[PDB]
A paper describes a structure:
Direct extracellular interaction with Rspo proteins inhibits ZNRF3/RNF43 activity. Here we report a molecular level analysis of the ZNRF3/RNF43 ectodomain structure and its interactions with Rspo proteins.
By using a combination of heavy atom and molecular-replacement-based phasing strategies, we determined multiple crystal structures for Xenopus (x) Rspo2Fu1–Fu2 (highest resolution 2.2 Å), xZNRF3ecto, zebrafish (z) ZNRF3ecto and mouse (m) ZNRF3ecto, (highest resolutions 2.4, 1.6 and 2.0 Å, respectively), plus complexes comprising xZNRF3ecto–xRspo2Fu1–Fu2, mZNRF3ecto–mRspo2Fu1–Fu2, mZNRF3ecto–xRspo2Fu1–Fu2 and xRNF4F3ecto–xRspo2Fu1–Fu2 (at 2.1, 2.8, 2.4 and 2.7 Å, respectively). The crystal structures of the ZNRF3ecto–Rspo2Fu1–Fu2 and RNF43ecto–Rspo2Fu1–Fu2 complexes revealed a 1:1 interaction between Fu1 of the Rspo2Fu1–Fu2 and a single ZNRF3ecto or RNF43ecto chain. The first, extensive, area of interaction involves hydrophobic interactions interspersed with hydrophilic (complementarily charged) patches contributed by the first two β-hairpins of the Rspo Fu1 and the region immediately carboxy-terminal to the β3 strand of ZNRF3ecto. The Met-finger at the tip of the second β-hairpin of Fu1 nestles into a pocket formed between the β3 strand and the αC–β7 loop of the ZNRF3ecto, which is lined with hydrophobic residues (I95, I191, V192, A198). The αC–β7 loop is a flexible region in the unliganded ZNRF3ecto crystal structures and moulds to interface the RspoFu1–Fu2 M68 in the complex. The acidic region of the β3–β4 loop (immediately adjacent to C104 of the disulphide bridge) becomes more ordered in the ligand-bound ZNRF3ecto structures, probably as a result of electrostatic interactions with a positively charged patch on Rspo Fu1. The overall assembly thus comprises a 2:2 complex of ZNRF3ecto–Rspo2Fu1–Fu2. The 2:2 complex resembles a crab with the ZNRF3ecto dimer forming the body from which the two Rspo2Fu1–Fu2 ligands diverge, without interacting with each other, as the pincers.
Numbering used by the authors:
A (entry chain C), B (entry chain A): 22 to 182
C (entry chain D): 39 to 145
D (entry chain B): 39 to 143
Amino acid sequence: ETGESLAKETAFVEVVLFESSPNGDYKTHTTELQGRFSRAGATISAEGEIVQMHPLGLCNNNDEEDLYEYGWVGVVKLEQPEMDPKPCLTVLGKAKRAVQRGATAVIFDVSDNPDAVEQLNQGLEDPLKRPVVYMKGMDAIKLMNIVNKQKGARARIQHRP
Amino acid sequence: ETGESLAKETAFVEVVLFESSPNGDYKTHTTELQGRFSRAGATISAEGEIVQMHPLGLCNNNDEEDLYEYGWVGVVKLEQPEMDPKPCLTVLGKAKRAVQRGATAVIFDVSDNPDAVEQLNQGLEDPLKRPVVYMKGMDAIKLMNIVNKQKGARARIQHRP
Amino acid sequence: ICKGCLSCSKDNGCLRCQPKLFFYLRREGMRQYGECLQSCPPGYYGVRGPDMNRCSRCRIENCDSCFSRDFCIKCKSGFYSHKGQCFEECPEGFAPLDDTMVCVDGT
Amino acid sequence: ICKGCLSCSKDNGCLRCQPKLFFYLRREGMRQYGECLQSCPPGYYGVRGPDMNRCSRCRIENCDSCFSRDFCIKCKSGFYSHKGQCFEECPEGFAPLDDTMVCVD
């Protein structure tokens, strides 16, 4: 019978806020956060503009969905599972759909749905070639606060073995 | 008496051409290239949309410049040294300036200016925090073909540890 | 705040709407959050689905007002309607009825 | 092909212009290439540097044609020109000269 699982590698997630000058120069200010690379995706670095996606918006339905520039980092905050009694897609399905729609990586805030982690790390479905990261606690609160309050931010997800 | 320098690490650069497909999805096609991480910048992964910069445009002299979206990967094709007899900036200077203007990374095609490699690798100035990569030969030819002919492309520069 | 939702969160807005209302996803910079409306905004049509009422974006070419994804109710000014689509001129075999923008068979 | 340049590159367009001309950086999507022009395009002014002549984008507030980085020659309709800048009304100290749009003392 099977034993315990290898601990998932740490995703170091730099969230970059930037400011332009009149001359066309940028200053940046980085916050470093941590999550984990799930088995649903590859363990590799990825980077792009942060785009929040409501969990209900990641479906095969609502078919005519809008068009974002390729290479965005999706941030999805999961709710308590009873808040979507019949999901259009599983959590894996939602990650895949974000990648279909141009996401270079997906970060799930799993604080309110810790069972999402187990589902992500099951490894039955074919894993995506992009990273699917999960975050919670302090780190997730900080990510979601920046999403909620700042104008734009870029995520840099680093794998450093 | 100093011996040979350690070899520079390989930068595995994946160039992604993307196309919106029937529903709002993207169809993508990937080209894998290789360069090297120079001492002028950090040895890390970076990703962003590709933006060619004419070498002569990277100067301090010309002042208010157009605001590009933060986080682009600069592609600079270097010419034969004698074509720019008194450069506005050294090659390190130009890379710095691209980072000031929001570059997440810089790739120099050094095919026509092999001496730039020694300059990038001198390691006397303090490195940028972003990668400064050089490429040549077929890799560089393939990169410039994409830049010259495609509508858009995303570079994913991977440090494979 | 949480107007019209049965349930709501800070980060996502509405998760579920009061039963009459339509669920609309508002994009504001990096944010995307749920709203629950009496009627879908300009550019959108409402779909009463098995679980939820949603707003979806009207993508019908030259349409000012969709009933569904595939059926236009109001064509852009200067376009003729035929079978839920909008044309600069009525397709072959059809003509505008009287002085209206609706195609009917003839001329 | 490579109009106006002494040296040209397939990837970068012109690298040096014949000495009359102005070097202009054309942006076309991902690409940036050099061209050599008799005169700078609309919205751009020319600069005769020590090395080369080049065009730069006018960014003076409410200007229609720049001389230089900070000196507007033709303000946009309704703004008065005052020492190279364009104002909605002359600044205290100056009034327009008769029927025109130049502030004077």
